[PDB]
Every structure is written in C-alpha cells, then in structure tokens.
C-alpha cells in the first residue's frame, strides 16, 4: 500500500501549484502525521516538510503543508526553476505489521517552455524478425513537455497488458522529453488481429498511432 500522488504537476515560474497526497483510514486517516521529502535528479531525498506543516531550517516559506481527513497537500508559491524535483509524502500505516508508507511521487515541472504534445511514431515487426519467429512493436514517443507520459497498447479495441515494457521519460537536447514503449508479440498473434494501436497519454490529450499486417 502507498499514498496516492499525482504523477506530474506543472506551473509557470512565480505561480502557485499544489501536490495532493491521499491515503486510507489506517494511515493519514488514523491520525498519523504526514511529512514531505524533495528529491533532485541524482540526489537523495531531502527533508522538506516535517510534522504536517513545519519547515526545517533552510526551506523557504514558499513551501507549506496541510492535512485533513485522509488527505494531505503540499503548496508551493513563487515557483522557481530550482524547485524542479520529485516530491514525496510519507506517513505511518498501522495495517499489516505496521510500516512507514510513502507516496508514489510527483514530478514538479516549472514551465520554461510552452507545453508540447508528444509525437508518436510506431513501427511494425520487421520482415526479418518474423523469420526469427519473433514480433516486436516499437512505439517511439518524442517532443513532449513536461516530461511525463502514459502508454497503453490496443489490439483491435481490447487492451494489451502482457508483454509491454515502457522506458522512463528522457530529457532531449531541446529540453523536451522522449520515451519509448515495446510490445513483444508472437508472429501468430501479430496476424491474428486486424490492427494494433499504441496510445500515449500526456496531460489531457492522447496521441494514437496504428499499425496493421
């Protein structure tokens, strides 16, 4: 069990964003305190908020925290480029044998660029790969910002949960982001369907590309 956190949260420099954190009746709902940790790329999690709302020495007053019910929230005002990091909420859970419970995490993006929808380029299994009795679908996802996506594969109209592995978003040279997803299929399963589709999700919109035998 974890605490639910939004995958991505974005805001322009100087503006204000909030990061939600929800739990259950056995952690935040049970009266346990919530704490927040900030983690920069390549660094360890650093204490940001302790005891629901307090601020360790060194953290600016732009960071504040609140908690109510089974929910907690981290509010950040006057957004700065230095705030770009991963933010984790944390509490204690009395369920199971008792354990510290962490939030899934949130990527905070300070918009120094207009938002960009991802360009999806999908490829089929090569002719040489079916001769090796294999079939791999390549979904290349490039040129999106902020760097956070979600991939789903569709065989005809049904979904595909087996044989899907997706990389994490990677920072391009133009500060946009790139990712890729792979679908390992069998040559018979590649032909037993009418079409295959790769659906990426970026904020609200969804870009989709299809490939067919």
């Amino acid at each position: 069990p974890v605490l639910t956190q939004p995958p991505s949260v974005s805001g322009a420099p100087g503006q204000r964003v909030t990061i939600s954190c929800t739990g259950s009746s056995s952690n935040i709902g049970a009266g346990y305190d919530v704490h927040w940790y900030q983690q920069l790329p390549g660094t360890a999690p650093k204490l940001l908020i302790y005891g629901n709302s307090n601020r360790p020495s060194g953290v600016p007053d732009r960071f504040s925290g609140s908690k109510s019910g089974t929910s907690a929230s981290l509010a950040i005002t006057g957004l700065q480029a230095e705030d770009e990091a991963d933010y984790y909420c944390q509490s204690y859970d009395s369920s199971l044998s008792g354990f510290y419970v962490f939030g899934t995490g949130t990527k905070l993006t300070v918009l120094g660029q207009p938002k960009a929808a991802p360009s999806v380029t999908l490829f089929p299994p090569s002719s040489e790969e079916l001769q090796a009795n294999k079939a791999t679908l390549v979904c290349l996802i490039s040129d999106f910002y902020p760097g956070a996506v979600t991939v789903a594969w569709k065989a005809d109209s049904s979904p595909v949960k087996a044989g899907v592995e997706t990389t994490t978003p990677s920072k391009q040279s133009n500060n946009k982001y790139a990712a890729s997803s792979y679908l390992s299929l069998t040559p018979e399963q590649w032909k037993s369907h009418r079409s295959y589709s790769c659906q990426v999700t970026h904020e609200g919109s969804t870009v989709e590309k299809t490939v067919a035998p």
Partner: protein, 221 residues
C-alpha cells in the same frame, strides 16, 4: 492534548487480584509502547514492564513476571495491568506512561496520575482520638504545644483541622505510619501562646471518610 487517566484507588485483601486501567487519549493509540512503573511509599521508581498498544506484545521485568499481566484494547485506547495473588508488599502507587512510538527505548513521555493500591487484611475502622494535653510547665519559649493522637484507623486517609478551620498557623499534621497491628496512626500538633491556655479553647476536627466517622476532641490542661 495528550491525557493519560488511570483508575482510582484500590483497597484489596491478600490473595485476590485487581485490574488497573490506563486510558490514553489525544493521539493515535496504535504504535506507542505503554510502560508500567511501581513506587512504594518513600521509595524509588521500579519498572514493571511494557506493552505495545496496537500489537499487544509484552516485555516483563524478571521481578514481576507471573504477578503483572499487561493487556490493551485498541478500540477503547486503554491499557490494563492485572496484579495477581495480592501481597501486602504489592501496596504501592502504580504509574502508567506513554513510551516511545514503535521503540520502547525512548523516554517516558506522558505519565498518568498514578493508582494507589493498598493490600491489607485489616477491616476498615474509625480512629480513636486522644488529647495531647499541654504541659503544666508551658513556658518552654512562652509557647505551649498541644494536639490530638489519631490512633488505630484503616484505611488512609484522615483529615485533621483545628477549630473548624479557624486555627491553621503552627499546625503540624504528621504523615501517618502503619503500626504493627495493620492499623494506621497519626498525630496533629500545634504551638500556641502559653498565655492563652486558660482563655482559648482548642478542638481538633478528625474526619475519616472511609469509615463515615467524625470526631471532635477538646484538649485542655
């Protein structure tokens, strides 16, 4: 706010058993160790053991295993301690205190008010008050000394006032002692001007609520 309220005083007979309670409010019950400490009158503190609030695991002192039994109810946020086969030696004040969260290695953070347990075979009895008359030779400092001897009463306590509360200055009511017979005895003395033995009238008002007894005793040369 963190409050730790314990059960009231207990007066038990040897051989019986008593269940002491320790209700803890103002915080999340599950996860904190709850400690139990024994203190005999005029002596120091003595650790009995601990119990985990949520999981009920217990750790007992070698001195108290088989005598103390810890239980806890997560639903009522209450810890209990059962003292079996009661001895007169078990007569003490028993404290419960919130320990460390998850780790009983921490300090005892929030203590209860304590629970006074008295174990004795004696039956409750009202005290006999006898005068401590001022001496015929009372020029010992131009000050005389008088009082009352509150003898043979069980259990504690007695309240002693002088002249229905009108006389408070110079009054010394000594802490009670346990005589060999199992009954408590006490003295309440006061020093008054040696020139006022003939004019003034001195009465000690002795009250012993557990026996529903009240006694006024006049002392005079």
């Amino acid at each position: 706010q963190v409050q730790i309220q314990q059960s009231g005083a207990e007066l038990m007979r040897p051989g019986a058993s008593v269940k002491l309670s320790c209700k803890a409010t103002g915080y999340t019950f599950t996860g904190y160790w709850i400690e139990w400490v024994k203190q005999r009158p005029g002596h120091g503190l003595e650790w009995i053991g601990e119990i985990l609030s949520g999981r009920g695991t217990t750790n007992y002192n070698e001195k108290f295993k088989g005598k103390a039994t810890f239980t806890a109810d997560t639903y009522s946020n209450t810890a209990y301690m059962q003292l079996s086969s009661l001895t007169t030696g078990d007569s003490a004040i028993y404290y419960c205190a919130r320990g460390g969260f998850l780790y009983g290695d921490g300090p005892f953070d929030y203590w209860g008010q304590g629970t006074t347990l008295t174990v004795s075979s004696a039956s409750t009895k009202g005290p006999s008050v006898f005068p401590l008359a001022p001496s015929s030779k009372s020029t010992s400092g131009g000050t005389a000394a008088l009082g009352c001897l509150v003898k043979d009463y069980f259990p504690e306590p007695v309240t002693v006032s002088w002249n229905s509360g009108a006389l408070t200055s110079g009054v010394h009511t000594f802490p009670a002692v346990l005589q060999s017979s199992g009954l408590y005895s006490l003295s309440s003395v006061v020093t008054v001007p040696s020139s006022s033995l003939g004019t003034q009238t001195y009465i000690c008002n002795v009250n012993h609520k557990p026996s529903n007894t009240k006694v006024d005793k006049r002392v005079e040369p």
